[PDB]
Amino acid sequence: GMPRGA
Amino acid sequence: GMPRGA
Amino acid sequence: MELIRIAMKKDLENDNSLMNKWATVAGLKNPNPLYDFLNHDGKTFNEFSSIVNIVKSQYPDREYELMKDYCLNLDVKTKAARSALEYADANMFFEIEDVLIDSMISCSNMKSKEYGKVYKIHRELSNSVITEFEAVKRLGKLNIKTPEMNSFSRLLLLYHYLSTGNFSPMAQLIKQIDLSEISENMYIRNTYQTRVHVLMSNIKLNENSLEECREYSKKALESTNILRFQVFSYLTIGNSLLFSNYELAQENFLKGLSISVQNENYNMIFQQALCFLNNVWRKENKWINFESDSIMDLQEQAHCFINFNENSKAKEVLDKLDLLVHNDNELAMHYYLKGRLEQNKACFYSSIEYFKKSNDKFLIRLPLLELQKMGENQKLLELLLL
Amino acid sequence: MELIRIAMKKDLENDNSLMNKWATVAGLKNPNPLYDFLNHDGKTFNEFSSIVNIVKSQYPDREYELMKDYCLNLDVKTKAARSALEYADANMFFEIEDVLIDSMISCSNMKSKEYGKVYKIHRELSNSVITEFEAVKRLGKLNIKTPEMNSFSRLLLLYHYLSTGNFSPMAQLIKQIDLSEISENMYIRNTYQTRVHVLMSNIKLNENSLEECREYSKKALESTNILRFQVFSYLTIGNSLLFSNYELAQENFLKGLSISVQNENYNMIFQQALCFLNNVWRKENKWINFESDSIMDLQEQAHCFINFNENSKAKEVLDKLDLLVHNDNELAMHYYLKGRLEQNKACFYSSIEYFKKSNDKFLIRLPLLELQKMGENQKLLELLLL
């Protein structure tokens, strides 16, 4: 999967 | 159209 | 003396057993609050449902006449008058409502003033006297204290989105409503519960969860004795069956029409419902409204003409429609009709695009069926329903 | 006596021009509050940004060491300590944060107690120590007074939804946040503004509005000097370019890595980013983490094996994955990988269905591209993006 973050 | 309502 | 109180006194003189029957219907522990209500000017029941229920049980055919006279004589500063405002809006008794609102805007009680001002915003928004932006701003500027008006400020936006074909925000906005925080006024809490059920039913219809749509309308019906909510429950249940069961859709629309035909507005709504159903099933259609110039009715004329190969009559109607401004939901239908007339794939693609903008996962079935008939990949079409 | 104060005294003795330079960087009218801070125990700046900015300007490599010592010596009843809590959470300094929280949950100041309790709910929710339901309930029970915690109680849910692949509720929840109601604490207001920008950027990514995604991350960058936010801005901007521009995605991920490589966690995040990018573009992939057993890393191993026709090595990895619990977003990716391995249309349909459940309009591009390459109707595919 693609890392997402905020 | 189709009538909608609440 | 209010007309309701004169009538009840007269009926009581002719039948003594009414005192106890009315007390049961009104949900009372004993007849004391009823004796008090009958004999003292301005004495009100603790819950507004008591008077409503008695009027529905005893004078079903005089409800408007009697409640108009009763509501317009209430002291606007009371809980009964606050209840009356919701009663009037729920039943679309606009003459009662607008008089109550105007009294309440400029009265000395702060609860009644806030109710009045929120309901005024709803009345204006739904009459296109103000925009959503202006409404949201005016609501912000009132620093709303009551959990009731906190609820209703959200409900009024839901109605606006429903009638402008803007379905995307509805699902999450409704979740914000917490009816259990309303503790003073049970009539308002219970009526709002009915409103939420009917709106939920519409939100599920638009998401294409149809069993759930039907469950919510069934819950609305069980929770209520108000014609307006019963009308919209039968409308929504019938709507949910538009593609899957002609007979059962028709049974719901006719049921709805049968209890509401005496009201012009509801009569029209069910004509439009039956009109739509018969076009979808390409049947002879006795429900077309030839006098009307609205997009909704012209679309149905064009749809019927197309079903019966009267193409140049269809083309005339569609030309009239090309000169009207459409919201996204209406334009989605417009492209479907053009697609049917011209047999043109691109029109069905455009139709799909506008149902997607509108977040209508229900009526999108119309152009998707045409693409299926033209041999497009059935699996991709099903995926376009999600 | 705090380490920051010792260090500043020492540096001031070696260079007198620092007094005025520090005063400028700290946003001060004159050096009085600096003189006061250096000489008097427990004197705090009006705005927490003054101390942060001095540390960033003068001791960029000692920030953690110095701010740990400084924050852990504050009176937890103060505005500075409230500021410190946010500073610690924003920078993911969990050791500082959890000590502050514990002090503040049981202190006599009501503002500090509320901050402590809301942040504790955030810490627990993000560690899967409690569920969303339990968190929403505990937050409801607190009867939150401050506009700050009103904001943060919504922010903490946004983070939860982002990390669980549950993108649907994010767009409407973020609209409810009103930062202009925060008047006391500018550090908190401004940091929260950065948070909102980066979250907005992620929401737009998931909606497939990519120019808008990039605009919000650019606004985050301009608004901030905090590494955590800069990291996630470059991550999100690079992500938004995953299908359209290999070189520019890579430039953003490398830029991000270049400012953050010294932090293990950020270093890993950018390796995973570059790992994903290189798989999407089917390049040789030096960024695979072979030691890891997480779904995220295993998926990337399998993806690489598939790109290079090592199908039975791919199949082994996918078997390991079949034994692990997936959320909807992860399972969508899983079906895409199975689809690629087997060249099987049905796997791409399933993939689409799970991206739709997850409300991911970005990564859905993966199975859609495969269907395009198999000659499925391109227009229907585009429509499945909306």
Numbering used by the authors:
A (entry chain D), B (entry chain C): 1 to 6
C (entry chain B), D (entry chain A): 1 to 386
Sentences from the paper on this structure:
The crystals of the AimR-AimP complex diffracted up to 2.3 Å resolution in space group P41212 containing two molecules of AimR in the asymmetric unit arranged as a dimer with one bound GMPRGA peptide per monomer. The peptide N-terminal amine is bound to Q299 and E300 side chains and to M296 main chain (TPR7), establishing hydrogen bonds and a salt bridge, while on the opposite end, the C-terminal carboxylate is salt bridged to R228 (TPR6) side chain. Comparison of AimP and DNA-bound structures confirms that the closed conformation induced by AimP reduces the distance between the DNA recognition helices. As a consequence, AimP fixes an AimR conformation unable to reach the two distant half sites of the AimR operator.
Arbitrium communication is mediated by the production and secretion of a hexapeptide (AimP) during lytic cycle. Once internalized, AimP reduces the expression of the negative regulator of lysogeny, AimX, by binding to the transcription factor, AimR, promoting lysogeny.
